[PDB]
Amino acid sequence: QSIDQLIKARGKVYFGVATDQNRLTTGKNAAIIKADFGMVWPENSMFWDATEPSQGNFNFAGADYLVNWAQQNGKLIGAGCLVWHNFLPSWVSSITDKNTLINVMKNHITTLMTRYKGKIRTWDVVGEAFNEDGSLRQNVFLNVIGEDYIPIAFQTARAADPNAKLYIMDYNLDSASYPKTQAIVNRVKQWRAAGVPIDGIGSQMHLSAGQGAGVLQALPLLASAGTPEVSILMLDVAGASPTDYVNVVNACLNVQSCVGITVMGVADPDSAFASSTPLLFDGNFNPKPAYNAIVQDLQI
Numbered sequence: 001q002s003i004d005q006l007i008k009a010r011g012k013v014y015f016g017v018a019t020d021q022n023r024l025t026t027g028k029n030a031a032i033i034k035a036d037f038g039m040v041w042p043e044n045s046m047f048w049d050a051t052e053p054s055q056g057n058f059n060f061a062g063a064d065y066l067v068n069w070a071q072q073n074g075k076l077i078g079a080g081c082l083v084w085h086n087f088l089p090s091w092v093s094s095i096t097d098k099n100t101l102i103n104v105m106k107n108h109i110t111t112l113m114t115r116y117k118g119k120i121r122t123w124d125v126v127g128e129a130f131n132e133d134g135s136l137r138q139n140v141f142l143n144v145i146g147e148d149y150i151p152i153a154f155q156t157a158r159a160a161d162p163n164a165k166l167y168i169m170d171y172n173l174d175s176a177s178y179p180k181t182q183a184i185v186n187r188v189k190q191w192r193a194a195g196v197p198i199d200g201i202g203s204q205m206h207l208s209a210g211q212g213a214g215v216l217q218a219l220p221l222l223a224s225a226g227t228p229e230v231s232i233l234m235l236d237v238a239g240a241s242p243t244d245y246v247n248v249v250n251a252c253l254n255v256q257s258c259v260g261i262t263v264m265g266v267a268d269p270d271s272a273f274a275s276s277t278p279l280l281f282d283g284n285f286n287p288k289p290a291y292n293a294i295v296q297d298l299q300i
């Protein structure tokens with residue numbers, strides 16, 4: 001049974017997965033995504049080192065493939081991350097002039113969003129902007145532009161494609177008592193109060209075993225920021241216990257504004273964390289106990 005169809009029957013928008021051309025053309029990934037998932041993200045092909053490896057030199061073959069495949073197969077598309085410190089080329093992080101970096105950031109945002117205008121449901125505009133203690137991460141954008149870089153990025157994104165839902169995402173938002181979790185909520189409340197167009201908070205849930213349970217308290221805390229949507233991304237769980245995965249799914253079901261969940265790949269061997277066997281399909285492309293547990297859960 002399709003977890004995406006089953007979650008939609010429970011009133012959510014999607015169960016999605018990260019993918020890209022060479023997953024689509026090998027294994028059983030295309031078959032599983034067609035049957036079982038309702039949304040795709042580019043696993044790597046939309047990151048800055050993939051899309052703008054030198055200034056103004058845009059590389060879109062990878063991302064085009066993904067977007068075209070999704071459209072042909074009636075799948076929603078999420079994409080990201082436009083502004084974060086990972087996968088960022090040296091030419092960007094060596095910029096020291098503030099107006100230059102502002103316009104470099106704006107051109108990156110606008111060129112990518114314009115190319116796919118109208119085709120992308122959700123854009124992760126800003127990513128990993130927080131330190132663990134809740135202060136803003138001192139990436140090149142904060143160091144050169146200052147904290148205005150976040151509102152600027154969001155405004156720029158809303159102008160480029162007003163149809164897209166715009167998200168901020170971060171990791172280690174999995175415990176309601178962790179300082180980072182309350183901090184992003186506080187700053188999102190304040191940005192939105194000031195007219196900054198943040199439609200969603202995305203929680204990057206690269207989890208260790210046993211961490212699923214805590215998401216049942218953390219996700220409602222994130223939703224208290226008052227964004228129209230929240231979501232779960234990059235989900236994987238070391239060991240892939242049915243208990244962890246079902247807890248995450250149920251957190252989504254519990255939180256009215258949570259639109260869905262995206263897993264960090266289809267089958268274990270294609271995970272960055274393969275030895276932890278953290279995904280829902282195994283190396284032979286069979287649905288694992290966690291997949292079947294999610295099915296049972298989703299089936300007062």
Ligand SMILES: O=[N+]([O-])c1ccc2nn[nH]c2c1
Binds near residue numbers: 017018042232265
């Ligand atoms: O949820 N995801 O797996 C995922 C993968 C890559 C991304 N880039 N921006 N947001 C993303 C989400």
